[PDB]
From Swiss-Prot, chains A, B, C, D, E, F:
Chief site of localization: nucleus
Co-factor requirement: Zn(2+); Mg(2+)
GO terms of molecular function: ATP binding; identical protein binding; nicotinamide-nucleotide adenylyltransferase activity; nicotinate-nucleotide adenylyltransferase activity; protein ADP-ribosyltransferase-substrate adaptor activity
Residues involved in beta-nicotinamide D-ribonucleotide binding: G11, S12, Y51, K53, W88, T91, L127, W128
Protein name, as recorded: Nicotinamide/nicotinic acid mononucleotide adenylyltransferase 1
Species the sequence originates in: Homo sapiens
Length: 216, 216, 216, 216, 216, 216
C-alpha cells in the first residue's frame, strides 16, 4: 500500500561525481525504509546551454558523462528534455513536465532530490518567489540528503513557507562523508591532479580524453 | 608621406546596424582630412562565444550579418579570428594579433575605433588595469567617433593615463545624429516593431527569416 | 457610446492638498475630451494605519481632511474601506475591491489615477512583482497626470510590461505647474509657515486647530 | 551600608515571557550577593506606539501582559510613563526620568538591565552617539544578564567607552539556559503552536483570547 | 553702528590659489554693502599634519604659500595655530579658539567663510553631528560665496537645521567665474602645465623651486 | 650544500613587540631544521611616512624601537632604506631592492617572512594584482609563521596562484601561543595599562618616556 515515488535531480552535473550517485542510493534506501514508500525510478536532468554560466561546458558533454555514470544502474536514468529546450526552464516547470509525463502512462509522485544548499538558497532575500517555493514544496516534495541535517532542520524552522509544508520535506542524514563537489573536481583538474576514485572510471576516462576542465 | 592606418572595431555586433557602418565612413573621412594619414582598410571583429553574455547570440550569426552589412564596401571587412578562439581574448591581444599580421606582409598602423563608452569604461574604478589602458592607447591609438565629443574630451582630461597619451587619441564629431544601438534594435525586435532603414536591407532580411531577437 | 470610467486614487493623503484635487479635474477633462469616454465618479482612498510609516498620521485625520477637501465636489468622494482593514492591502486588491463593488450594482471600469512617480516606482529593481504590474495595467488601466509626461513616456518605452500594455496607459499633461507635495506641506508646517492657498481653506483650518505636522 | 539600586528594563515586551521575568530575579540575586548592594525595586517600561515598528502591537496590550506577568511579584512593577508620551523617547531620557522621580521622594540609583544584545548594539558603526553611550554607562550603570558573558566581556574590552566605565557594568551569568525570545514566541504563535510554560499562564490566556500574533 | 566681523577660512590650501583670495574680497565687499556690517580682518587657517590625507603636503609649505599669497594685503592674514596642534581640531573648536582670542583683547564676531561644498557636506547622511552644525551656524554664522547660489539656497531650504538658522547664513553670488580649485592646480602641476596667472606670482615661484605636486 | 636564506619582514612595527621577534627565531629554527637550508641573516624593514595611516607614528620612532629590540641579536637587523624613500614602496620592490643588494656583494636568497594575514590579504577580491602575487611567491618565497597553519594551508589550496607556487611557501607552526599584536599593545597603552613583558624592556622604556600611543 506504499506510495510510489520518482526521484528527480536537477543541476549542472559539471561534472557528475560519485557524490551525486551516492545521493540517489541514500535517498531510496531512506524512502523505502519509511515503510510508507517505494522508490520506483530516479532521474538526473542536467541544465541546458541557455543557462549561460562561466565554466559550464556544453550540455552534450554533461549529458554523456551522466549517461556513463549510470549505465549499469538498474533504476536511475538521464532525461535530456530540459537540456534540449531553447529557453532556460525553471525547476518548477521541469517538475511539472516530469509529473505530467507519468500521468500520461495512464500514479507515481515525483519529488525533488536536493541538498541543504537548496534550502539555503530558498531564503536568500529576493532570490526566490515565495509562491514558487510554495508550489515545489507543496505540490511535489523535497528529499534533502545531507551531512548537516542539523543545518537542514534549522532552515526549515526559520522559513514559514518551509515550516508550513514540512510534512512534505524529508531530511536525510549521510553518515558517510563523501563531499565530492563539482567545484572541487574542476579545481583538481585544472591543477593536473588525479580524480580517480572520486568519479566513475568511465567518467574519468571521458574527461581525460577530451581534456575537459584542464584549461583556465 | 601620410601614415597608413587600419581601423579595427571590436564589439558584439549584436546585431550590427547602420550606426556601426557610419562610424567607419566618419572616421576615415576624418583621418584622411587631417592631411596626416591615409586610411587603408577597416576591420570589424565580433566577440566570440566564450564571452558568455545573456542575449548574445551565437557568433556565426553575428559574423554573417556583419558580412552581409559590408558585402559592397570597397574597404571594410570581417575577420573571424577572435570569434574562433576557444578562450575569450582581450582587446589588447586582438590588437597585437592584427598588427603582427600586417607586419607579416613584410607598414600600416592599426588603431582602435570606439565611441565614448570606451572612455567611460576606462575609468570605472577597478575595471581596467592601468597598464593595459596604457598599452592600447600608447602602442596603437584610439579613434573615438561620437555625438558627445565634449564628454569625450572631458574623460581624456580626467584620466592621467589618457591625458598622457592624448596626442594619440582622435576625437571625432558626428554632426548627424544616428544613435541606432544594438540594444534598441533588440528591444524593437522583441516587440515586433519594424527596424527597416536602421540596418542594411539584407541584415534585416536575415534577422527576419531566422526570427532572431524575437523571443524573450 | 463612450466608455464609463471611475477614477481611483490611492495614497497617503498626508495631507491632501490642492494638487491632488487638481489631478482629478485634469484627468476627467482629458478622458472626456478623448471622445471615447465619460468619467462618472472619482474616489480618493487613503492608506490605513497598518502601513506603519513615520510621519504618517492616524487614518481618521487623513480621512477627515480628504472629506473636507471634497465636500462641495459633485463627483469625487472618499471611501474608507482600505483605511479600515486590519492588515495592509495592496493596490491591486484595492482595485479589485472597487471594481467588484460596481459590478454588484448589477458596467463602469475603474482606472488607477497616479503620477509618474508610480512609473518610476514600477521599475526599481526588485520592488514590484512583474505579474502584479501586469494585472494593474492590463486589467484596470493607468491615468498618469504629470508635468513631465516626457519622463512618463520614456518609462513606458523602457519597460516591456508597460510597453506591452501601453494602449491602456493615458499620459496626461499638466500645463499649469502646481507641485504642491505633501512632503513640502509638512515641511512648511513644522517651520511654522503659512500653507494658505495651497490646500482648501477648511483643510488648512483643521490642520491648524489640531496642530498637525507642527512637531518634529 | 550597601547601595540601594532600582532595576529598569526598557524594551518592546512584545510579548513578555518567562525569560524577561527570570532576568530580574537573576540580577537581584547577583547584585544582593555582591555584599555591596541591596536591590529595592524593579521596573519594566515598554516602548510606546510612536516607535513605529512592524509586528509591534499597540502598547496597551503590551502593558497589560506585563501587568499580568508581574501581579504576584513583591518587587517588580510596570510604569506606563514612556508608553504614554506622544513622541518616542530615548533610553537616556527614560533613565533620567526615572532617576529624577526617586530624588523627588526626597537615594536609590537606577541601573539599566539589559542583555549582551545591548552591548552588541552599542558598537554598530554609526548607530549610537558615543556621548549617549557615555552618559548611560557612566551616570547610571549597566547590569548585563546573559548566557554568553564571555561575549559580554569581549565587547567591553573592544570599546574604549565601555572599557573606560567598566567598573560600572556588571556582567551576570545565567547558568540555566532559558532563551525564550519574543521573536520565537511570535513565530510559534503564528504557526498555531503551544507557548504554554514559556510565559505566565495569564499572559498565555490573554494572548489566546485576543488572538494576538496569530495573523501574518 | 554696524557690526564688526572677522572672516575665518579653514581648509587645506593645498595649495592656495587666486580663487581663495578672491573669496575674501568678494565676501567683504558684500558684507560691507549690507549697510549692516563692517569687515575688520580676515584669517586663513590651514589644516595641520594630523589630518593625514594623501596628497596633502606638510603644513609648513602650505603655511608659506599662504603667507606669500597675502603679504601685500592690508586686511587678510595667516594664523598657524590650528596647523600647530598635535591632534586634529574640528572647525567648531577652531572657531571657538578664534572668537575667544578676540574677546581677550578686551567685540568683533567671527564668521565662517566657505562655499556651497560646505553646505553639500552638511547633509551627507551620517557625516556631521546635527548639534555641531547647529553650533557653527547659530553661534558664529556662515558666509557662503559661490557661483551657484541657487544650489546654495536649495541646501538651506532642504535642511531644518540650516533653515532654522538661515538669518545667520549669507549666500554671496560670484558673477565672475574663477573656479581655480586646488585639485585642478595639482592636476595641472603633475602634468607639467603652466599655472601662471591662476595663483600669485610668488606662490607659483615657490611651487616651482620646490618641485611641489610634480610627482605622482 | 644547504641553501643560504635571508629573512625579510616588512610591516609597520607600530610598535614592535615580542611576537615579531619570536617569528624570526621560529622561522630560522624551522628553515635550518629542514636540512635543506641555512638561515644567514634577518631583516626588519619598517614602512615609511608616505604610507599615511592614522595611528601610524613617525618612522624614526618605529626605527628606534626596532633597533632597541634587536641590539643584542647576533643575526637580525634593521634597514631603514624603505623608511627613507620619499614615495611609498610596494613589497615587491622592497624585495627586489634587498635581493639586488646581496648580489652586489658579488648567493643568498631573500624570502618574505609573514603570517597568515598575508595570505588572507592576497585573496581579497580586487586588492592585489595577480601578477604581483605571482612574482613575490615565485621569485622570492614565503615563510608563513602562524598559530593557525591549518587556515594557512587552506588559503593556499583556495588560490591557484598560491597553489601553483606552493613548493615555495613554507607554513610554520607556532606551538606556543604568543599573540601580542601591535593593535593590542596600542589599545593597552591608551588605557594606561602595563605592557611590561610583552615587548623588550628597552622598547617599553622608550614608549614610556616619549608617552607614545597614550593619546587618543
Amino acid at each position: 500500500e506504499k506510495t510510489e515515488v520518482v526521484l528527480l535531480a536537477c543541476g549542472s552535473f559539471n561534472p557528475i561525481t560519485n557524490m551525486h550517485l551516492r545521493l540517489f542510493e541514500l535517498a531510496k534506501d531512506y524512502m523505502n525504509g519509511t515503510g510508507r514508500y517505494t522508490v520506483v525510478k530516479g532521474i538526473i536532468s542536467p541544465v541546458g546551454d541557455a543557462y549561460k554560466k562561466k565554466g559550464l561546458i556544453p550540455a552534450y558533454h554533461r549529458v554523456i558523462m551522466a549517461e556513463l555514470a549510470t549505465k549499469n544502474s538498474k533504476w536511475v536514468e538521464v532525461d535530456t528534455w530540459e537540456s534540449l529546450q531553447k529557453e532556460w526552464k525553471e525547476t518548477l516547470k521541469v517538475l511539472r513536465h516530469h509529473q505530467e509525463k507519468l500521468e500520461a502512462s495512464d500514479v507515481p509522485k515525483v519529488k525533488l532530490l536536493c541538498g541543504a544548499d537548496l534550502l539555503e538558497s530558498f531564503a536568500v532575500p529576493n532570490l526566490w518567489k515565495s509562491e514558487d517555493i510554495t508550489q515545489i514544496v507543496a505540490n511535489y516534495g523535497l528529499i534533502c540528503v545531507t551531512r548537516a541535517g542539523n543545518d537542514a532542520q534549522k532552515f526549515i524552522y526559520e522559513s514559514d513557507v518551509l515550516w508550513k509544508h514540512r510534512s512534505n520535506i524529508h531530511v536525510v542524514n549521510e553518515w558517510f562523508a563523501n563531499d565530492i563537489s563539482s567545484t572541487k573536481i574542476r579545481r583538481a583538474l585544472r591543477r593536473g591532479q588525479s580524480i580517480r576514485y572520486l568519479v566513475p572510471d568511465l567518467v574519468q576516462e571521458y574527461i581525460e580524453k577530451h581534456n575537459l576542465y584542464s584549461s583556465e
